């Protein structure tokens, strides 16, 4: 069935928490699991002039958003897969799953 679940929170600490519970949730049911894989952090940089007018020493800021991504692969028949998505929803940590 090849259940593939992706997790792409902007925040890492709670993402690990919502990831830590999943892997133990598979083994507690004695289910085959393929481990979490942490993709490289996506750093979103934006470099802009500091000043709102055009005057002054040429001072620049850059702003970084970190987009951590995690995903864990599972295989199981359908009866125990629909009982996973509907739980473990935490703020700013979206969860998406793809079958097959």
């Amino acid at each position: 069935i090849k259940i593939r679940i992706t997790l792409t929170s902007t925040k890492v600490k709670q993402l690990e928490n919502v990831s830590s519970n999943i892997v133990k949730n598979a083994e507690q049911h004695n289910l085959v699991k393929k481990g979490p894989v942490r993709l490289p952090t996506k750093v979103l940089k934006i470099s802009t002039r500091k000043t709102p007018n055009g005057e002054g020493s040429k001072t620049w800021e850059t702003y970084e958003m970190r987009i951590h991504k995690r995903y864990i692969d599972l295989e199981a028949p359908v009866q125990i897969v629909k009982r996973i998505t509907q739980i473990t929803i935490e703020p700013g940590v979206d969860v998406e799953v793809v079958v097959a």
């Binding site: 009866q79 009982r83 509907q86 739980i87």
Partner: protein
């Protein structure tokens, strides 16, 4: 039924104006156990009454030919399948016939077994046997031996007995001997009624019995079919997951549907 945004408390004085305070209580801790499973009555217009049974031995008995209407999703599901399932039937809506599916479930596959029935109170023991003295034994040639505290039957008769009816406390004592009691090896299906007594004192006696068989099934590595007889129960999900039942087959009907309508009235004193 439509979940409101919140549940809010209001405090208001009775003499002044505006002496009011408000708190909006959110409820988000809504988990899959926190629900009623239930089933909607589907289109089951055509039954399989008696004719579609493939056993003339029993087709010659039980003169009530039409199949039970309230067994819509039950019908022949457990008749052939070995899978544990929960059947919650409010009131006396077929408690006699539905409890008799144990012979239908796996007795034809292997006959001459000692499938054990369990009743919550000793009163149910007499009716579960006395009414059946002229319905099954004279036609199926299978004897039933009651196992109670006031009865001490010959163990050879118990071994040769087909159906055993025992209260959980009396069943507990014989359940203390699974290590050496050669009587208890033929357990393939265990059936009990009024399984929602756990809130009572006797519920703990019955509850620990099921977990005993789960270890037996887990340790001995063979499946043991279970069957639950009860009325509508609020926490259907948690008990279903504890009996080890699976998606195919689950009976949860509310008090709205009954063989006879029920009228109610409230008063205070």
């Amino acid at each position: 039924d439509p979940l409101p945004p919140q549940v809010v408390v209001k405090v208001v004085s009775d003499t002044w104006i505006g002496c009011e305070s408000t708190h909006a209580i959110s409820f988000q801790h809504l988990i899959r156990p926190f629900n009623e499973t239930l089933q909607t009555k589907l289109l089951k217009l055509r039954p399989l009454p008696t004719s579609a049974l493939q056993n003339p031995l029993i087709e010659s008995i039980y003169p009530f030919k039409y199949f039970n209407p309230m067994q819509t999703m039950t019908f022949y599901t457990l008749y052939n399948t070995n899978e544990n399932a929960f059947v919650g039937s409010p009131t006396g809506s077929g408690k006699t016939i539905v409890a008799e599916l144990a012979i239908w479930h796996a007795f034809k596959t292997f006959p001459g077994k000692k499938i054990v029935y369990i009743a919550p109170m000793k009163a149910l023991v007499r009716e579960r046997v006395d009414d059946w003295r002229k319905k099954i034994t004279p036609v199926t040639g299978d004897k039933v031996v009651e196992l109670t505290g006031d009865s001490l039957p010959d163990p050879k008769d118990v071994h040769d007995a087909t159906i055993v009816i025992t209260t959980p406390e009396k069943f507990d004592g014989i359940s203390r001997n699974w290590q050496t009691r050669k009587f208890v090896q033929d357990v393939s299906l265990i059936i009990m009624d009024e399984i929602h007594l756990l809130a009572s004192d006797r519920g703990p006696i019955l509850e620990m019995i099921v977990s005993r068989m789960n270890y037996i099934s887990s340790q001995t590595k063979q499946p043991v079919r279970l069957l639950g007889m009860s009325t509508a129960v609020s926490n259907a999900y948690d008990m279903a997951g504890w009996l080890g039942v699976k998606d195919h087959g689950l009976y949860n009907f509310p008090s709205s549907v009954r063989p006879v309508p029920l009228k109610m009235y409230i008063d205070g004193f």
